[PDB]
Amino acid sequence: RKVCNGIGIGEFKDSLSINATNIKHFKNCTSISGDLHILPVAFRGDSFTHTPPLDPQELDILKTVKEITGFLLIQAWPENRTDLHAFENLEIIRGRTKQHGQFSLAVVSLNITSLGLRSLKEISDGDVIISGNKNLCYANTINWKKLFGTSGQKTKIISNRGENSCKATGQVCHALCSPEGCWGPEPRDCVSCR
Amino acid sequence: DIQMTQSPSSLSASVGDRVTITCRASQDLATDVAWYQQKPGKAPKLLIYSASFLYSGVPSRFSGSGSGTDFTLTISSLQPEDFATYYCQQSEPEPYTFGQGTKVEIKRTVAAPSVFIFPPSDEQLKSGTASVVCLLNNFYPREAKVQWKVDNALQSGNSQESVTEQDSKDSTYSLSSTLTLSKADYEKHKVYACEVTHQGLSSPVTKSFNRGE
Amino acid sequence: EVQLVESGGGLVQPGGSLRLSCAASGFTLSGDWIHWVRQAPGKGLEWLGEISAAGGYTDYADSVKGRFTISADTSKNTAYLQMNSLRAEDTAVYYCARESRVSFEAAMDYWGQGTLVTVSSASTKGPSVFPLAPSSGTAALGCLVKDYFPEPVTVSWNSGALTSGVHTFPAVLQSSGLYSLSSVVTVPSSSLGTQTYICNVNHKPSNTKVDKKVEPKS
Ligand SMILES: *[C@@H]1O[C@H](CO[C@H]2O[C@@H](C)[C@@H](O)[C@@H](O)[C@@H]2O)[C@@H](O)[C@H](O[C@@H]2O[C@H](CO)[C@@H](O)[C@H](O)[C@H]2NC(C)=O)[C@H]1NC(C)=O
Ligand SMILES: *[C@@H]1O[C@H](CO)[C@@H](O[C@@H]2O[C@H](CO)[C@@H](O)[C@H](O)[C@H]2NC(C)=O)[C@H](O)[C@H]1NC(C)=O
Ligand SMILES: *[C@@H]1O[C@H](CO)[C@@H](O[C@@H]2O[C@H](CO)[C@@H](O)[C@H](O)[C@H]2NC(C)=O)[C@H](O)[C@H]1NC(C)=O
Fold it and tell me: Domains in chain C and their CATH numbers?
């Protein structure tokens, strides 16, 4: 059990994103007190702040994170990666702080085919925006209302892979899943089993 | 099936040489034999049909002969671009058996390799592995000895070679040798040397670098 | 003007199935006979079967009868090879070819570039791409394309604008069971400060393209 500051606080003050220099400070963290931003600048590197490009393999550091008290923003991801592998153990996003005061989960313009947030059981407050992920299927299968803790939280799933195209390519929940939907095509991705 | 047996299995001939390749059918095919040329990484190209008929656009140096069971493809004057595997085909009826092929390689004058060495990139090093690459560029004949020395110690079991197919214009080869070490092993030694022995070299040539310099 | 293009090759697990396609242009499949022929790495050619898209008549080699079948969509001007129950030994480049009408016989006058089907109980893995930095008259530089599976990868330089002096080596299987190769090029030393060099790597089996700028080390 280890609590660490999120982006914008402490060691991460004035950081734009999880990046090559700061990612070591998340080692062994089980709870983020604050928000996580993952932006294109992370992977490109940044001359001004003397930040080398982030080796995507370093994202595995995040696998110990079970809780984010604020928001999770992902607007860049290894195109190589079919899902949000680093967040496979994330159980709760509280949304005590929200992006623009509105969003607790924002997954934007990635190359992923599934979210893969297999451990996620609660988003306590804030809206969910899943937008512009042209290869992304499965997101509409989740019963978002049940993850939500605050009346009036919204989920909007816009401009990802067409529903018809996901059906045509077989990118739907495994036969073994209950009607609660799934985070990807495998039996381990089912919210619950039949 | 009808069997199609080609000879020779391979041949090395000089530019301007006459080349004859033979294909023997297990039964009488009359003149129902086609011949193809296949360059490496490319699809076969039709040269001859009905044993002796030149397909449109094929150079006149190619000719075919025979009927019954014995068939021949002749290249009257070999050109450097004729480096290929050549196949006969029983063209009637199904299942259209192809011969096993004859590999034709070009013989030419000796040419020494130009040798280059490349240290591992810093990007690879942060990943925990070091590849060191030695290049032998544009040489003949194919046979070469390429040895890695690390602080003067001869390496064994930790390198692989790859050789290009013969160049269709000047008939030379190029060769890469890649030495693989762990980052830890790479960082505990200083001098990295590739030593090349070849007919075109009066004595072996060494290219080397010092790690970090 | 006549062209055939095969697609669909890649990794298949033993016991799995795959359909290859053969897109024709410059002639119609309807009215002609099309053949499928395969070639295992470093081996000879093996006829698999034929189809007349018009009428749908097919014939097959005894070796694949019951497992491999051929079809065609005349509206798409495309032929298909359906391969069931694949085994390691079915690993090969698969070609489609048009039967010529120069004569009665099955001379095959136009062939596609071929598509490589790898049957293996292994995982698809895209390449790591590292620079082989120049300057260590003429400078040599390159890209190391390492740790991918299955074959093949293609490499071009500056999107195909650089071809002179390029050698892309045959891949070699490493002890890890993953492929590796280098692509190298020689250029004038004087061009290193004024000409950008980028290697373009295409690994079709994993639908991965990678571009790498190769520059002198400082
Ligand atoms: C995604 O691709 C990278 C390599 O691709 C890059 O090569 C770099 C050296 C740069 O030139 C990049 O611009 C280029 O795109 C793979 O490294 C990675 O695969 C991972 O590699 C690790 C080391 O080989 C290995 O430990 C991991 O197991 C492996 N991932 C997996 C699970 O296969 C690719 N990432 C993937 C496939 O998720
Ligand atoms: C990447 O993270 C590092 C921290 O590891 C950031 O570096 C800090 O930047 C701010 C603003 O310039 C300074 O106040 C700190 O002193 C820096 N700390 C260190 C240790 O260097 C960097 O800004 C981040 N870069 C991006 C683009 O996110
Ligand atoms: C971006 O994501 C797509 C979708 O997953 C990747 O394309 C797939 O690659 C796999 C091999 O790993 C193929 O079997 C699929 O057929 C491809 N999907 C389709 C239908 O296009 C693509 O490789 C990703 N980009 C990068 C750079 O890795």
Answer: 1-121 (2.60.40.10), 122-218 (2.60.40.10)
Note the maximum CA span of chain C: 67
**Distance between CA atoms of residues A16 and A76, nearest Å:** 13
**What is the rounded CA–CA span in Å between residue C13 and residue C30?**
34
Task: Tell me the sheet residues that pair with A39.
Answer: none
Residues of C in contact with B131 (CB under 8 A): 130, 144, 146, 180
Strand partners, B37: B45, B86
**Chain C partners (3+ C-beta pairs within 8 A):** B
Among candidate residues A117, A88, A111, A104, the one with its CA nearest the CA of residue A161: A111
Strand runs labelled E in C53-107: 57-60, 68-73, 78-83, 92-99
Q: In B17-34, which positions are buried (b, 16+ CB within 10 angstroms) versus exposed (e)?
A: eebebbbbbeeebebbbb
Q: Which amino acid is at B188?
A: K
CA distance C96 to C24: 10
Determination technique used: X-ray
Phi, psi of B198 (to 5 degrees): -160, 145
The span from the CA of B130 to the CA of B158, in Å, is 11
Length of chain A: 194
Range of the domain at A74: 1-194
Omega cis (within 30) before C127: no
Count of domains in chain A? 1
Name the β-bridge partners of B148. Answer: B194
The whole-angstrom separation of Cα C140 and Cα B115 is 10
**Cβ proximity of C70 and C38 under 8 Å:** no
Domain B109-213 has CATH 3.20.20.140: no
Residue C114 contacts B where some CB pair is shorter than 8 Å: yes
Q: Domain B1-108 carries which CATH code?
A: 2.60.40.10
Distance CA B111, CA B169 (A): 14
B122 Cβ under 8 Å from any chain A Cβ: no
A124, A93 Cβ separation under 8 angstroms? yes
Q: The CATH number of the domain where A12 resides is what?
A: 3.80.20.20
The number of CA neighbours under 13 Å toward the Cβ of A60 is 3
